[PDB]
Design an enzyme around this catalytic site. Structure first.
Site, short mmCIF file in Angstrom:
data_model
loop_
_atom_site.label_atom_id
_atom_site.label_comp_id
_atom_site.label_asym_id
_atom_site.label_seq_id
_atom_site.Cartn_x
_atom_site.Cartn_y
_atom_site.Cartn_z
N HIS A 100 0.84 -1.19 0.00
CA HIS A 100 0.00 0.00 0.00
C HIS A 100 0.87 1.24 0.00
O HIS A 100 1.86 1.32 0.74
CB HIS A 100 -0.92 0.02 1.22
N1 LIG Z 1 -8.31 -1.91 9.22
C1 LIG Z 1 -7.68 -0.89 8.59
N2 LIG Z 1 -8.21 -0.28 7.51
C2 LIG Z 1 -7.59 0.74 6.88
N3 LIG Z 1 -6.40 1.23 7.27
C3 LIG Z 1 -5.77 0.70 8.34
C4 LIG Z 1 -6.38 -0.40 9.08
N4 LIG Z 1 -5.53 -0.72 10.09
C5 LIG Z 1 -4.47 0.12 9.99
N5 LIG Z 1 -4.63 0.97 8.96
C6 LIG Z 1 -3.72 2.00 8.49
O1 LIG Z 1 -2.85 1.40 7.56
C7 LIG Z 1 -1.53 1.94 7.67
C8 LIG Z 1 -0.56 0.81 7.84
O2 LIG Z 1 0.75 1.31 7.99
P1 LIG Z 1 2.01 0.46 7.58
O3 LIG Z 1 1.63 -0.99 7.52
O4 LIG Z 1 3.00 0.83 8.79
O5 LIG Z 1 2.38 1.05 6.25
C9 LIG Z 1 -1.54 2.95 8.80
O6 LIG Z 1 -1.56 4.27 8.25
C10 LIG Z 1 -2.85 2.65 9.56
O7 LIG Z 1 -3.47 3.80 10.09
#
Ligand SMILES: Nc1ncnc2c1ncn2[C@@H]1O[C@H](COP(=O)(O)O)[C@@H](O)[C@H]1O
Ligand SMILES: [Zn+2]
EC number: 3.6.1.71
Length: 180
Positions: A100
């Site tokens: 992502h």
């Molecule tokens: N269930 C979820 N749905 C959407 N975004 C999420 C969820 N859980 C965590 N996040 C976000 O996804 C990102 C994951 O960050 P990273 O894996 O460190 O790149 C962070 O910005 C979180 O706020």
DNA sequence: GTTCTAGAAC
DNA sequence: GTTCTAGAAC
């Protein structure tokens, strides 16, 4: 608990939730980050499953570039008149599965920004620029990250705009208001 | 990744 | 006494 229900698999659920989707095409989906760390914070994800940047290869080069272009289009369509600064990029070591791209405004004005890890994950070399990742894949065929990434998360708190040192998250959050 | 909260830091 | 951080989550 189950594998599918594990917290790390949460993006696989959100990316299919129509209420979280802001853009969809044949290759990618853009969702609102569930815990946005700034006023605008989206994630761009490919439909195809790639666990992380560790699994990215040159076959994915077009896709990475497309994710970037789509991120830029979302900025224009949803926040164009705001003229805010944005960065697009990847955490060097992600927590959530499924590749992502972060598309995030640089105010960092959000109650979800709560700790040093949050701050340093977006404001040190831990945050890999999208253009840098793309160029790395193009030239080297794979994404590699240097040692010492976890230590970066423990760095003293410093403003990203004026580089001032702040002793705490609450004091940092208050300082950031000055740069609106 | 978040939630909760003990106990450190102030 | 209150604010603040940082580790367990079975
Ligand atoms: N269930 C979820 N749905 C959407 N975004 C999420 C969820 N859980 C965590 N996040 C976000 O996804 C990102 C994951 O960050 P990273 O894996 O460190 O790149 C962070 O910005 C979180 O706020
Ligand atoms: Zn500043």
């Amino acid at each position: 608990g189950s594998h599918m229900g594990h917290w790390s698999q949460g993006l696989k659920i959100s990316m299919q939730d129509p209420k979280m989707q802001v853009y969809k095409d044949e290759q990618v989906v853009v969702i609102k980050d569930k815990y946005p760390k700034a006023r605008y914070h989206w994630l761009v994800l490919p439909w195809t499953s790639i666990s992380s940047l560790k699994a990215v290869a040159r076959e994915h080069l077009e896709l990475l570039k497309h994710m970037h272009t789509v991120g830029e289009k979302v900025i224009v369509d949803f926040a164009g008149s705001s003229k805010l600064r944005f960065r697009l990029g990847y955490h060097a070591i992600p927590s959530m599965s499924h590749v992502h791209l972060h598309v995030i405004s640089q105010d960092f004005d959000s109650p979800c920004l709560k700790n040093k890890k949050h701050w340093n994950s977006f404001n040190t070399e831990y945050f890999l620029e999208s253009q840098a990742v793309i160029e790395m894949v193009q030239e080297a065929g794979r994404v590699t990250v240097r040692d010492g990434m976890p230590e970066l998360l423990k760095l003293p708190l410093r403003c990203h705009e004026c580089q001032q040192l702040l002793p705490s998250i609450p004091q940092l959050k208050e300082h950031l208001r000055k740069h609106w």
